[model samples]
Target: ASRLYTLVLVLQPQRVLLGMKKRGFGAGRWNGFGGKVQEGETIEDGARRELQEESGLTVDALHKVGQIVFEFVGEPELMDVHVFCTDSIQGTPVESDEMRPCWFQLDQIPFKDMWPDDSYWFPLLLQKKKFHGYFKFQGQDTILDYTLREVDTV
Candidate 1:
């Protein structure tokens, strides 16, 4: 079975906001703010909640940007992650037990410190395009198979 997850990226003219995940699945990596979807809440709500919990920032608006289905070779479960983008946010980003927020210039995104597949599809997000992707990971740092492309909608 596949589990649902949410990831939100805050974009600015020349920069992007990311958080250094301090715990959980993507610990030790720099990535967007997000987590699993909770019962009774929409995907966007979960994205917003996780962003606030991890970065202390509230997004004023969220635009669905991409969806990626990730599978692990030895695992039976798949991660169906819905990605969002927001240009409107409130509050100053502050460090939390779960993450530390930081901003990076568009050309300076730390892809090497992020999920391996991020380097494949993240550029679409920056281009303000919708996308869909599927990736099979052998482990945290290796991709066994993958397909990624821009789309008309998520």
Candidate 2:
């Protein structure tokens, strides 16, 4: 079983908005903005909420791009992350206490500083393809094994 989470990636023509996680899980890494979906909230609602709270911007709509299941050794619960993408956004993506917003060119994304699994599926996302992935991590930075592919829909 997995705990539900959301990840929203803001895309422009050739760049994306990423957050430097300042605290909590995955701190010190650059990743898409999101967090756990709270009780009584729809998954989509939670996604937008976290995106706004962490990045100080709001998006009207988000495309459901993918779903991923992550299993880390020594952790009993898996992470089921719903991946979303949007090109339309409102407000400046300002920095919040939880995250510092920055735009990264598609080619310049810092995978070494992010979760190891991102490098695998981010390209599929940029291609505007929907997909699902499963990653088994030995630790925070090492992916023991993984499977990913593009899908018709997610």
Candidate 3:
């Protein structure tokens, strides 16, 4: 079985918006804003809600850039993560219980402090291309294998 989730990456000319997790599963790591979608919510609904709650940056629309599936050993669950990139935002990014907003230039992403798969897909994202990915992991930090491909649609 798989669970639906959404990740929104705010983009600007030469920089991208990310957040430093203050607590919970990804505490201390830098990553995009997202969370599991509530059962009754649409995918975008989850992204929009989490975007405002975690980073305080609200936007009217989101552009889907990719979709990824995450598999971890010893579980049948798949984290079906829908990825989005948006250049528009409203209000200032504010710190919250879950994350502290931060912007990083294209050349300055802190991959060392983020999920291992990010290094591979981020380039595609930065190029404003659509792609699909599947990452299988062992433990939380180890990448056993991954498949990434640029796609005409996501």
Candidate 4:
């Protein structure tokens, strides 16, 4: 079990969008589109499926941003999170049973409604910068430490 997942950054005319669900794991917060990579499913496939499932849109382009793995010292589930980018996509944003797609103006992103660390590095992605990070989070708050490293396209 590699514990890998993906995130798709969907951009639109008015604002960049993040989907949120009122219930479930990550409820009441806006986040990039994504979910766990299923058994035998490639990262790209997972990204594509999540994007379509949550946003009703098909991404026309995808940029490999970077990845972050959460290594909790005693936790059973270690998360290997992969981040991707897509400045172009097609289709209309709509609500799904698990998500609601909402656009936020570049300068008006609802930071209060997002994870705190989102404000730290999401901008770098929007600007097309390539980087990777590892996290030690204690329930959504940075605990120990992590690094942001740049990676070359392969």
Task: Give per-residue CA lDDT, model 2, range 1-154, as digits (tens).
Answer: 6899999999999899999999999999999999999999999999999999998889988999999999999999999999999999999999999999999998999989898899899889988989999999987878888999888979
Q: Where is model 2 poorest over a 10-residue stretch in terms of lDDT? A: 137-146
Q: What value does the lDDT take at residue 47 in candidate 3?
A: 96
For every model shown, what is its TM-score relative to the native structure? 0.97, 0.97, 0.97, 0.87
Q: Tell how far residue 31 is off in model 3, in angstroms.
A: 0.5
List model 4 lDDT by residue over 106-151, tens digit each.
Answer: 8888777886657766777766777777776777655477667667
lDDT of 3 by residue, 29-129 (tens): 89999998998889999999999999888997899999999999998889999999899899999999999999998899999999889999999999999
The lDDT for every candidate, in the order shown, is 0.92, 0.93, 0.93, 0.77
Give per-residue lDDT, candidate 4, residue 143.
49
After superposition of all CA atoms, the RMSD between model 3 and the true structure is 0.9
Instruction: State the lDDT at 114 in candidate 4.
Output: 80
- Residue by residue across 1-154, what tens digits does model 1's lDDT show? 9999999999999999999989878899999999999999999899999999988899778999999999988899899999999888999999999999999999999999999999999888888889999999988989999999888868
The alpha-carbon deviation from the true structure for residue 53 of candidate 3, after best TM-score superposition, in angstroms, is 1.0
The true-versus-predicted C-alpha distance at residue 69 of model 4, in Å, is 1.6
lDDT of 2: 0.93
